[PDB]
């Protein structure tokens, strides 16, 4: 079994702009005893479902500006927290966290809730994982909103998606050094550095899930998994490419956080070329890596784009 700890609800008591009522699932196939938290907003009987996937080191809090917009259009919004993150249970051992550990959780959740007509909404690890889900059951997915993300494939198949692991020094090397080498990891202080428009209250909401380092085994493992891609990760990621090029016939919307040192234009303009029918990217000039902090514009533009297409 997997040994996990749970964050005290008290830590989430007064989160700025997070009025969303909690939903949980403690009975997922392959994840016994592990309770997963997810948001389930908007009309539950909606034709469209926006599945919003977060990355590192965030949780569904990152979608708080986008969720109202999507919901007001008549849609259902599902925003799950990865194990190790947010209000989900947190495995204490880093080795329990793998690519398939998170990917199979997502497949398990989509089946349990039986989600169809999915507009996939992705960024960072939500992208790395999320972009390999449509091929597993393509009839469930109808659209994609891709923000600063790509696939964890091998450096030969796609050099773009590995070159940042090399450089620049103030880029990935800094991002990884800040997350895996501090024994005193203050996620609010980290997020104030990498998302410099965050208010003090917003930033502390990113530290809320982690009372102390014993809750951060999953926050440490994600950077390590980018650097050291395992065979299952490469095979699934490289097979996902062929899906996006050849099989994908759904509506796509892309938005780039232009100030992002790691997963900005040089990762995203390759990513565009691989997604069949991907239009011109909305380039948000003032946005860094966490484009969802400029998410009200992205959400509105995506709905406008999708509506003026079909």
Residue of 37, 102, 289, 305 with catalytic role: 289
3-state secondary structure of 104: helix
Question: Active site includes 124?
Answer: yes
Upstream peptide bond of 50 is cis (omega within 30 degrees of 0): no
Per DSSP, 7 falls in state -
Q: List phi, psi (to 5°) of 297.
A: -65, -50
What does the alpha-carbon distance between residue 264 and residue 289 come to, in Å, rounded to a whole number?
Answer: 7
Residue 54 among the catalytic residues: no
Q: For the chain, how big is the Rg over CA atoms in Å?
A: 18
164 neighbors 270 (Cβ within 8 angstroms) = no
- Closest listed residue to residue 84, CA positions, set 96, 71, 67, 74: 96
* Residue 292 CB contacts under 8 Å (≥ 6 apart), including other chains: 62, 63, 65, 66, 123, 147, 298
- Taking the C-alpha atoms of residue 93 and residue 4, their distance in angstroms, rounded to an integer, is 8
**155-to-132, 197, 288 alpha-carbon distances in Å:** 17, 34, 24
| Residue given tokens 């599902």 in the structure block | 78
DSSP string for residues in 170-232? IIIIHHHHHHHS-SS--HHHHHHHHSTT--HHHHHHHHTT-SSGGG-HHHHHHHHHHHS--HH
Indicate the DSSP class of residue 91: E
Task: Give the integer Cα–Cα distance in Å for 124 and 132.
Answer: 13
Catalytic residue among 102, 124, 188, 305: 124
Yes or no: say if 210 and 190 are a contact pair by the CB < 8 Å rule.
Answer: no
Does the annotation flag 194 for ligand binding?
A: no
Phi–psi pair at 34, nearest 5 degrees: -80, 115
Task: Count the alpha carbons within 13 Å of 129 in the hemisphere toward its beta carbon.
Answer: 22
Across 55-181, the runs of DSSP E, i.e. the strands, are: 76-80, 90-91, 118-122, 141-147
Q: Go through the domains of the chain in sequence order and give each one's CATH number.
A: 1-310 (3.40.50.1820)
**Annotated binding residue at 172?**
no
Q: What is the C-alpha separation between 200 and 189, in angstroms, rounded?
A: 9
Q: Has 289 been annotated as catalytic?
A: yes
Q: What distances in angstroms separate CA 167 from CA 170, 172, 226, 287, 288, one per listed residue?
A: 8, 7, 14, 20, 17
**Cis peptide upstream of residue 107 (ω within 30 degrees of 0):** no
Dmax (CA) of the chain: 50
CA dihedral over 65, 69, 72, 75, signed as positive or negative: negative
Question: Which one-letter DSSP state was computed for residue 53?
Answer: -
List the catalytic residue out of 48, 89, 188, 260: 260
């Amino acid at each position: 079994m997997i040994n996990a700890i749970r964050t005290p609800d008290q830590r989430f008591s007064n989160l700025d702009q997070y009025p969303f009522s909690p939903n949980y699932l403690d009975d997922l196939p392959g994840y016994p005893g592990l309770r997963a938290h997810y948001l389930d907003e908007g009309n539950s009987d909606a034709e469209d479902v926006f599945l919003c996937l977060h990355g590192e080191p965030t949780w569904s809090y990152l979608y708080r500006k986008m969720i109202p917009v999507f919901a007001e259009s008549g849609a259902r919004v599902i925003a799950p927290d990865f194990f190790g993150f947010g209000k989900s249970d947190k495995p204490v051992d880093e080795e329990d966290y793998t690519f398939e550990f998170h990917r199979n959780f997502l497949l398990a959740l989509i089946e349990r809730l039986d989600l169809r007509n999915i507009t996939l909404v992705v960024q960072d690890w939500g992208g790395f994982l999320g972009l390999t889900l449509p091929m597993a059951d393509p009839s469930r997915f109808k659209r994609l909103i891709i923000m600063n993300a790509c696939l964890m494939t091998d450096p030969v198949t796609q050099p773009a998606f590995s070159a940042f692991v090399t450089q620049p020094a103030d880029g990935w090397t800094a991002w990884k050094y800040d997350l895996v080498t501090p024994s005193d990891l203050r996620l609010d202080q980290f997020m104030k550095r990498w998302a410099p428009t965050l208010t003090e209250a917003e930033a502390s909401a990113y530290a809320a899930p982690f009372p102390d380092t014993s809750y951060q085994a999953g926050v440490r493992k994600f950077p390590k998994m980018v650097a050291q891609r395992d065979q299952a990760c490469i095979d699934i990621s490289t097979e996902a490419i062929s899906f996006w090029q050849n099989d994908w016939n759904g509506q796509t919307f892309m938005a780039i956080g232009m100030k992002d040192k790691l997963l900005g234009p040089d990762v995203m303009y390759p990513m565009k070329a691989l997604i069949n029918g991907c239009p011109e990217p909305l380039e948000i000039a003032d946005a860094g890596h966490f484009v969802q902090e400029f998410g009200e514009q992205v959400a509105r533009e995506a709905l406008k784009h999708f509506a003026e297409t079909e």
